Design a protein around this ligand. Sequence first.
Ligand SMILES: *[C@@H]1O[C@H](CO)[C@@H](O[C@@H]2O[C@H](CO)[C@@H](O)[C@H](O)[C@H]2NC(C)=O)[C@H](O)[C@H]1NC(C)=O
Lengths: 51, 172, 172, 172, 109
Amino acid sequence: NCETKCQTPLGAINTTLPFHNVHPLTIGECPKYVKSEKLVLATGLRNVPQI
Amino acid sequence: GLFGAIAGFIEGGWQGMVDGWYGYHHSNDQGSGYAADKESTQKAFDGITNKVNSVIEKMNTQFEAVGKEFSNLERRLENLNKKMEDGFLDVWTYNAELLVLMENERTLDFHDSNVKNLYDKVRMQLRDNVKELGNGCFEFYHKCDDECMNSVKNGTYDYPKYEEESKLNRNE
Amino acid sequence: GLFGAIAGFIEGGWQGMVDGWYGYHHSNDQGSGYAADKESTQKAFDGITNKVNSVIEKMNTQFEAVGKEFSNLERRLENLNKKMEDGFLDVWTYNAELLVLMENERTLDFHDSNVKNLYDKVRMQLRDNVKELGNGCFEFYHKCDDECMNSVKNGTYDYPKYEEESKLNRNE
Amino acid sequence: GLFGAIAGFIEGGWQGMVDGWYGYHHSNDQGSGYAADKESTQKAFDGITNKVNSVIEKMNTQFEAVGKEFSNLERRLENLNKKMEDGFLDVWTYNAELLVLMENERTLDFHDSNVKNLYDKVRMQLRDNVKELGNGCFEFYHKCDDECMNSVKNGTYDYPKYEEESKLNRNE
Amino acid sequence: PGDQICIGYHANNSTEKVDTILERNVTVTHAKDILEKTHNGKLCKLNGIPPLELGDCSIAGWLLGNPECDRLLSVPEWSYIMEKENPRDGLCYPGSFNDYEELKHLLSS
Ligand SMILES: *[C@@H]1O[C@H](CO)[C@@H](O[C@@H]2O[C@H](CO)[C@@H](O)[C@H](O)[C@H]2NC(C)=O)[C@H](O)[C@H]1NC(C)=O
């Protein structure tokens, strides 16, 4: 009884993120598929513990 | 880092500044506390947002693979379809992971440059009226109170005005 | 910038130097005027030309799509042809736009490094015989006339020779 | 270079240090010789190995083309197969050559940053107890023997202890 | 005795970790995850319009009116078609279907 804007054979997707590792074959307005495990964008700087 | 500010002399960072990314705190007998730079932080923030909006939107168009079925006398065509779609997935995956890695490293060193540059910007201002401690802090050859601390911040600390008091005040 | 020279202390640039990209102008009672560095400018120019010839020729080979027609029972094959050619156009388009962006940024910061480095190169030469104004200009603790200005340019200003006049000349 | 250390002031390098990538040699009446930095060299080595293992393994998956035969009524399909496989070879070839070029340049400038940073790290330590010769060498306003030379190396040369001898010792 | 002014940057409790070419797992103040790893494990309608489930029937079995495909005799509009890998009910009388795949692709539209 669920509804979605993006569907894959394994399940549906609700996401604002412009990518997924889930399944190559999709139907809808969907984020782009890749084979990556992790995709992580550095925004801030390195963490140096205050010493 | 690459510009040597972070895990260089500054050696660590201050949990006590929530005001933005980088900045100062001072010891005035008048008063002491953490205040962070408006202009530099603003600039860096803008640049970063531009970097993420630049990447995430550099795949707007990008390969999307939908469906297909072939007979058992179509085997070559099937294998070709597979090799192509797989090939492109591989390609865009590489493109993505790599771009992320680069933009990451470049981002961190970017922050470094920001810091070191802010520092050098202060130094080239106050230079001979103060001792550089080498720890990323400036010890005074006179008193800059706070209004004038904030004049250091705003970028004009009025050098020659405070020149003499420190000129004799130093040596010893 | 990234090395802090441009829109850093130098704060702007001189329409009065057409001689090349970066350089100096001096105040000698003897004379004053704009003359720009031969070696640095030469180097940067060479590096840049190498960068553009390196990019434009990094697509020499690159995907070119010509023609095709399919029957209405060929629909899958047609769609596959379309998805492939489109896919590659997308790929090379991305590759191009991105490479341009990077090489651009890297080019600008490159110029920065050139400038800041030239400066530091002068400073480490003349250092204690002059005051750094912090604006990207060197005030003299003695007179360097012009021959010797051009000796600053050529890279040997003969420090110890001019050492003493400034050694006593400074302080005050 | 980009950070101006190499083919900048340092002007060349020492065949007499096999101990690692960069470091020092000193003149003590006590003794003189080449010893290279443990921590910096270690760091750079690690970073580099991470870069090569990062590239060579960023093609682990990557396009591999095997075989095919078509009839003479299959000519379009053949041409499509050819254009695709060729297309991908071109793509991965570009990706490889380019990545190598970038990572190369970035590697060299990386070494530069390492050097210049090590230098600035020394300077911000010993600063007013010594004259910078501008050649990338530090002349002494006192004697640091060797234990304390190695204290310079280990990062604490104990400034105030040696402050006074040089404080009066300098001038002249 | 004196007056002084330091310079420095931010820091927090963040364990958030990124990578780079030069440096492996590295902890930073802030980061964005650009990858979506999760799904609700369900098959759903698509913008209010539900898919057509072929159940145990193939496309052939459906269009041809295989008796085992019954509820499919009349069906409303669909957002997409759910068919199994190796559906049970296709051609009950053995046979062949010409240009089957071209037809299914036609159905994709
Ligand atoms: C898709 O995700 C959004 C965001 O999580 C869901 O919309 C939210 O629904 C919850 C619960 O009703 C509300 O508290 C939020 O205010 C909603 N946010 C937004 C932006 O709409 C939505 O339910 C999800 N779609 C489905 C059907 O699962």
